[PDB]
Design a protein around this ligand. Structure first.
Ligand SMILES: C[C@@]1(CO)OP(=O)(O)OP(=O)(O)OC[C@H]1O
Ligand SMILES: C[C@@]1(CO)OP(=O)(O)OP(=O)(O)OC[C@H]1O
Ligand code: SF4
Ligand code: SF4
Lengths: 401, 401
């Protein structure tokens, strides 16, 4: 099912149909602040961001990039950096060659190149720089910055149809056309297929699915997939997952970014967490152990069940750094915590290891299952720490080198 | 695209292809606690739960249901109640007819009916009760409680194939077969097509999509769709949305429930919120105004942007009760809050009303767009309260009766 694509290396990270779908993010510190940006790149990388983007918006930002890269390399952090260019990318890349060389990838937006004839020249200049330095490029369209000349073109084509489409449908058409035309122009200039990634983001899920299906049909490039401007909190999380899932299940998408608005004081790493959860939920990557647990209902005996589930989740997170170093494959661990006999044994048998608490009407004992069979039955006090010891014993055996 | 189905009324709430996809939830208080359960049914309903399920697990639970229903009706709360039966449903429904009459729907699990021959008799008894009272039924299979006799049957059929499938694939087959056979048996007994809903839940997203596609092909019934045992926190939210979205976009699903494990002390209403967000993200329902906002990046000028986005989201939530009463259609409101000129004007033009803050390099002014055109430009202090006044003025005009 995975769409075949050429491989594009973003630094040491390969993107494309033969490679795992890469998680990426973008900093939100001012790029001119070397200390703050370096720190956030590191933080994002440590959280799971395999590629990190930073805006390169003005001369002060450009001047900071080589120093950011130097500091990352000094700690052996080889996380690739993507520069995000708008309006003046051709000028910054021309004027600051050390910045152009320090970056691992350039992002161009076909709607933020300039006016009229200037747009093609600016484009060309950026692509020439990339070719000269052997850098990959993302041609990233976004409907928040759609090339107006292209929109008018397609509106006029639409108006000629026997059955014109809606204005909204035409905007989607223009967005795809913008990406596809810029992709083909870059190819025609001599930028290699191993150096082009495409995106074309919109902020509504159903629209994103239409767009990406069209991009995937009309191009061969690896695709950077994300729902732009997803918003805040649960809404932003849900919309992001709902938009990406249909496309990922159809084999479309080579790298993802989750565009969450942080709440004031919420860490910028949250979007990385959500990206990882999307991929893992769909079986496309394994990053860390996970917990399958029922909602609980009036059959569940006390607040113990919710406490135990949370304690297990916490413990897995705490053990992971050590486990990752010792036990190959542990990222695939699935642990169940269940509230009663209705689904508890059966769901637990589908995990690597699971506990079925006794709910209402049951004898006060908790069977524990591993590899689909009864392992033991726990009773009394301290069931949580007993179970967590059995999980540790399980991991040490199952994921032994 | 919506799959056509007969209409099944769950109380006053119609379920099926001609009706909006209904949000449902399940209580987690002990059903025997009348006060606690009534209160939680009300809370869930007020949060958006159009249908509420409660376990009816033992005689004490059964005895409480008529009193719960009576209390709800005394306040004019017509929220339909679904009784969740396992193991002893035939006995409780027989012994407590006032409970059977008080419920609006019975849920049966074909894997929790009993042993051997007893399973068909128990089934039949429950279906007979439902027919006698004119109640609808959900036949709800779950792979945590899969009928073992059916699994063996299908394992033996599998073993005879020239190319047997995996054990995991056979479990999925058995789950679908369990639901389909019980559905057909209920039809054959004389339960009407206007009285049968089906589910067949699994805890892994990709599996849920396979299962529901099969259920949808093989049956005509409205389908209750949910990812069972989704787990806690962001993982549970993401997995739920990722599993449901592909199916909802294909037109499959007539009611949903989100199976989140609450954190200790987290309200049971969170699953309702997530369910609403799934449906609204996909354009299938509109419950309340929403905010489209960028992630912010190093182009964004201060923590003001995140604060403003959050303030707008909060204000919309606070205004909604009044707005819903005054202004028809307001649930469809889309408001944008954007961090800079790159995408700010364009995204704002796609909302009903939006603000584009000035980011780095820009003059300290914030254009505001409404209905796709410039409405005003804000400057100075108090931009948040000015914008929120313009949102109020907008709503009063656009959503006027
Ligand atoms: C930074 C921007 C600029 O176009 O990048 P995109 O890749 O278009 O989209 P997203 O990742 O949602 O980030 C916000 C955008 O403003
Ligand atoms: C209550 C149970 C019982 O089978 O209901 P289902 O509808 O099978 O699934 P879900 O809504 O995930 O709730 C948990 C289950 O244990
Ligand atoms: S497994 Fe038991 S306690 Fe958990 S939600 Fe299902 S019926 Fe309730
Ligand atoms: S709209 Fe501007 S501030 Fe917001 S993420 Fe995009 S480039 Fe950054």
């Amino acid at each position: 099912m995975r769409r075949p694509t050429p491989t594009v290396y973003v630094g040491r990270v390969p993107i494309g149909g033969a490679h795992p779908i890469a998680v990426q993010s973008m900093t939100n510190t001012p790029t001119r602040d070397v200390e703050a940006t370096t720190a956030q790149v590191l933080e994002l990388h440590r959280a799971g961001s395999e590629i990190v983007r930073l805006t390169v918006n003005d001369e002060e930002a450009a001047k900071a990039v080589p120093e950011i890269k130097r500091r990352l390399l000094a700690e052996g952090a080889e996380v690739p950096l993507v520069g995000d260019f708008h309006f003046n990318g051709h000028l910054l890349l021309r004027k600051y060659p050390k910045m152009a060389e320090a970056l691992d990838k350039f992002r161009i937006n076909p709607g933020t190149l300039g006016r009229g004839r200037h747009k093609d020249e600016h484009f060309a200049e950026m692509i020439r720089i990339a070719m000269d330095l052997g850098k990959p490029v993302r041609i990233g369209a976004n409907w928040g910055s759609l090339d107006p000349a292209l929109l008018t073109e397609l509106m006029d084509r639409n108006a000629r149809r026997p059955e014109p489409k809606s204005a909204h449908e035409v905007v989607l058409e223009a967005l795809v056309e913008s990406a596809v035309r810029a992709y083909e122009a870059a190819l025609e200039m001599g930028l290699g297929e191993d150096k082009l990634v495409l995106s074309a983001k919109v902020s509504k899920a159903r629209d994103l699915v239409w767009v990406y299906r069209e991009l995937a049909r009309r191009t061969q490039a690896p695709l950077h997939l994300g729902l732009t401007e997803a918003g805040m909190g649960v809404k932003g999380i849900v919309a992001s997952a709902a938009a990406l899932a249909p496309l990922l299940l159809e084999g479309i998408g080579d790298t993802i970014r989750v565009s969450l608005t942080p709440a004031p004081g919420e860490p910028r790493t949250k979007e990385v967490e959500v990206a990882q959860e999307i991929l893992q939920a769909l079986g496309l990557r394994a990053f860390a152990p996970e917990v399958t647990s029922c909602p609980g209902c009036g059959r569940t005996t006390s607040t113990f069940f919710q406490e135990l589930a949370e304690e297990v989740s916490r413990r897995l997170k705490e053990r992971l750094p050590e486990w990752r170093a010792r036990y190959p494959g542990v990222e695939e661990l699935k642990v169940a915590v269940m509230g009663c006999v209705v689904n508890g044994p059966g769901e637990s048998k589908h995990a690597h290891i699971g506990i079925s608490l006794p709910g209402a009407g049951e004898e006060p004992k908790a069977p524990v299952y591993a590899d689909g069979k009864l392992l033991t039955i726990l009773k009394g006090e301290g069931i949580a720490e007993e179970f967590l010891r059995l999980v540790e014993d399980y991991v040490k055996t199952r994921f032994a080198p």
